[PDB]
Design a protein around this nucleic acid. Structure first.
Lengths: 53, 53
DNA sequence: TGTTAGGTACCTAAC
DNA sequence: TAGTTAGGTACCTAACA
């Protein structure tokens, strides 16, 4: 439901920063018609990690 | 020898415009490492089509 | 161990 | 109908942290 860009802009980081933290958390994206989507559970965990640090 | 960026910088045109003219001219790039290269003969043809138009 | 900026490859909607 | 640009998508890494 959330794309990388949507997440990146809520957190005010670059898209690659979203991708870098998603890989630190060994989160994997769902690709639909070529575009990554972040599941709502994985979303929260990404924001928690970018927020704390 | 030439990358898409190099040619697009010479002609003061975007990279996709180089690619669009290359497909018009049935010009095949050579991809290595993950980077397209244009030989000088094909390179000569792209400048002709872009600068005449 | 981390961001960002700036590269690479592609695509298409709007002029 | 036939361009071009801008702005998206995916992915990578050097430089500065």
């Amino acid at each position: 439901m959330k794309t990388i860009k949507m997440v990146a802009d809520e957190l005010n980081v670059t898209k690659q920063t979203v991708v870098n933290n998603a890989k630190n958390l060994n989160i994997s994206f769902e690709k639909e018609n070529g575009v990554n989507y972040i599941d709502d559970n994985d979303y929260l965990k990404i924001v928690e990690k970018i927020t704390k640090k």
